[PDB]
Each structure stands twice: as C-alpha cells, then as structure tokens.
Structure 1
C-alpha cells in the first residue's frame, strides 16, 4: 500500500507567522484526469479530523484562506499563513488514488506563546472517599507555558515519590497554555498518619517553586 511519511516540526511557531507542513508519498498521486488526489486534515485537541484541503490544493467549504496547498506528484506542502492559536493540533495528509486510502503519520503544530506561571491548587481527600478507605490528594497546575514542569510532593515536610500519578493536557486551542494534574493516592490510615500535605511546582517562570498546602 502507499506509504505517506511526515516529518515533525523542530519547534513551536510564533502566532502570525507562516508555517509549512510536509508530506511525501511512495507513489504518484497524480491521476489520469490531471488532478492530484491528496487531502490535508487538521485534528484539533479532542476533536474529530476536519478536512482542510482536497485535490492537493482545493480548499474545503468554510476553510480559512490562510490555508493553501501545493506540491508535485509525490511531495506536498500545506502552508498556513498568519498561524493562529486555534490551528494547533495534528495535521495529516491522506491519499485517494489506491486502496487502502492511507493517511500520513501526522505532524503536530504547537504555538510558542509568552511564558506563563501555573496557577496551582491543592485539594484534600473527600469525606466520601475517606469512608471508602482511600485518600487521594489532588494538585492542579493550570494554564502555564512552556510545557516543561516539575511537581514535588511533601508530607509533614518530607518528600514523597510513591503513589503519585501525573497527567498532562495538550496545548489549549484558545490561550495556547498547558495544564497538569498530580494525584497522590494513599490508604485512609496512611493519610490519617500525617497533618501537612504540600504540592510544589517548579517552572521556568521563577526561581522559587510555587507551593500550595493544607493541614488535615
């Protein structure tokens, strides 16, 4: 089957600038009718794929004129003029000349916005979970940039590394920021054996970690 390869972007791009995304096919997509059957799709965070371009250079209905496509028979390029926060996600090209109609590996687009420190919030276990014998302490590190970040848990002033699970969101389509949740899970008895619970966020935006805590 036809194999379509795509290379990753080397860095996040600046809003307003022009960006080019490439796609390469192992076989020509030029059909006997002189048309080249290559589609470009954008899959925004948490959404279904949306067609941007078809027939290599034809814009789909309602697609912004900031998107244009060019290329030869095996090398294609999607050009995005004046890139916007809403353009983040993964771009995929697809061929429509031979079964199966394969998709490329996809290219992620990130926006490099101004540095932003995270808004940190910590939450004690709920009375409901406690009656269940469990105790989860949750910490949210919201709306920061860049994406690199480190969270440290402390219990009664002592560092903790066991029972912690983190999750990161993709880049926000509206404000180009990132968010993370850190959850420390312990048995009820363990939780009842300490008083101070602290979440410590270290970001590039500052020398000192942002600290949030509570006393049981």
Structure 2
C-alpha cells in the first residue's frame, strides 16, 4: 500500500560535482524503535542491485564514503559526493517497514562530459549470412556524446529507411559516452542488386556528417 516516488532522471552531473537524489514515501518509515527503515540501491546496466545504504543512513559494508543518506520520515535523500564516471546507473530506494517492501521507481544518474564525435565503422554482410538468403549491413557508431545522434543509410546514393533497426547502449561507466548500432537488413537478392552501401552519421560535434561506405 505504501507508494514511493522518485524522479525518472536527474539533470546531467559533471564528474567531480556532488548530487542529491530524492525519494518520498506516502507514509512515515520511522519505526517504534527509533530507526527509519529505508534502503538505497544502485543498479548498473546488466548488473544486480547493489545496496548502498540501509536504515536510512547507515552505509553498507565496502560502500564508498562518498555515499551518504539523510532524511525525515517521508522525505529522504541520497547524497553522492564527488561523482565519478563509475557511479552511472539507476538509484532505487526501498521501504523496509511493512509488507510489501516496495521499491521506488528509480532515478537514473546521467553524467555530463565534453562533446565527442562518434567513431563510425561499416560492415558488409558476411559470406555465412548470404548463404541463408539474408543480408545485414551493420554500422557501429561508438563513443560519442551527447547521446543525440542521427544515422542515414544510402544504397547507390539513395536513402533507404525500411528494414533499419537501431540499438543504443546505456552511458559508459568508464568514459561516460554512448554508442549505437544500426543494421540495414535486406534479402540477398536485393543486396546483390546494388553496389554502394553508405552509413551517414550526423552529430552535434560537426556540421558535416561522418560518412563510411563500401562497394560490393
């Protein structure tokens, strides 16, 4: 029955800056023993949640002192001192007073850093895939910032939008950059009908797009 609220995202924080994450409960979490039962977790992409703080302000074993918790009974805050690239992820609070031990919706920490142009690489279908009657052309756009980016596919000079699937990674824990994969899937017959395949990337870091291509 207890509902906990948290902001989806935080303003981008620069490495070195400190930030406070908020969490509010619909009911007091202070117990008759004087202790407040609130937990703070950090979860990185593909990683299991990691406990940072329990009992509202007690740091868990091995947890960096840069992490501290405070609050009343309905409003809690997690302060992260001198933020580092490694702290990127989603922060969740969990009330541990009454069942069910509901979790907050999580607040994603977004790191801010210098703009970076993507490294673009284009790959023709492999001979193995062509034997299947399918043909995927792949383009990697790695290590760029900000996350906003546009990719265009051109076959023999003409833009192709159908059959394109993109995938973005979460913010990197080491350099705070983003990466994206774009795949243009065609039938082998169609792939065999054209010669020039081009991947064009348009990013904030430049007026002119980054072009990568190959001839079949």
Q: Classify the TM-score, shorter chain.
A: over 0.9
Q: CA deviation at 1:7?
A: 1.4
Q: How does 1:29-178 map to 2 (within 5 A)?
A: 29-178=29-178
Q: CA RMSD in A?
A: 0.6
**In 1, are the aligned partners of 2:8 and 2:105 still within 8 Å (CA)?**
no
**In 2, are the aligned partners of 1:133 and 1:187 still within 8 Å (CA)?**
yes
**In 2, are the aligned partners of 1:41 and 1:92 still within 8 Å (CA)?**
yes
Aligned pair in 2 of structure 1 residues 10, 69: CA closer, same or farther (>3 Å)? closer
In structure 2, how many angstroms separate the alpha carbons of the residues matched to 1:68 and 1:8? Answer: 20
Q: CA deviation at 1:139?
A: 0.2
Give 5+ residue unaligned stretches, structure 2.
none
**4+ long deviations beyond 4 Å:** none
Q: CA deviation at 1:201?
A: 0.3
SS at match of 1:82: coil
In structure 2, how many angstroms separate the alpha carbons of the residues matched to 1:151 and 1:170? Answer: 18
SS at match of 2:213: strand
**In 1, are the aligned partners of 2:198 and 2:213 still within 8 Å (CA)?**
yes
Q: CA deviation at 1:45?
A: 1.8
Aligned residues: 216
Q: How does 1:168-207 map to 2 (within 5 A)?
A: 168-207=168-207
Give 5+ residue unaligned stretches, structure 1.
none
**In 2, are the aligned partners of 1:43 and 1:91 still within 8 Å (CA)?**
yes
Q: Output one character per residue of 1:32-81: Cα deviation in whole Å (capped at 9) or x when no partner.
A: 10000000000012210000000000000000000000000010000000
TM-score in terms of structure 1 length: 0.99
**In 2, are the aligned partners of 1:31 and 1:37 still within 8 Å (CA)?**
yes
Q: CA deviation at 1:10?
A: 4.5
SS at match of 2:111: coil
In structure 2, how many angstroms separate the alpha carbons of the residues matched to 1:146 and 1:169? Answer: 13
In structure 2, how many angstroms separate the alpha carbons of the residues matched to 1:96 and 1:176? Answer: 33
SS at match of 1:86: helix
**In 2, are the aligned partners of 1:45 and 1:173 still within 8 Å (CA)?**
no
Q: Output one character per residue of 1:98-146: Cα deviation in whole Å (capped at 9) or x when no partner.
A: 0000000100001001100000000000001001100000000000000
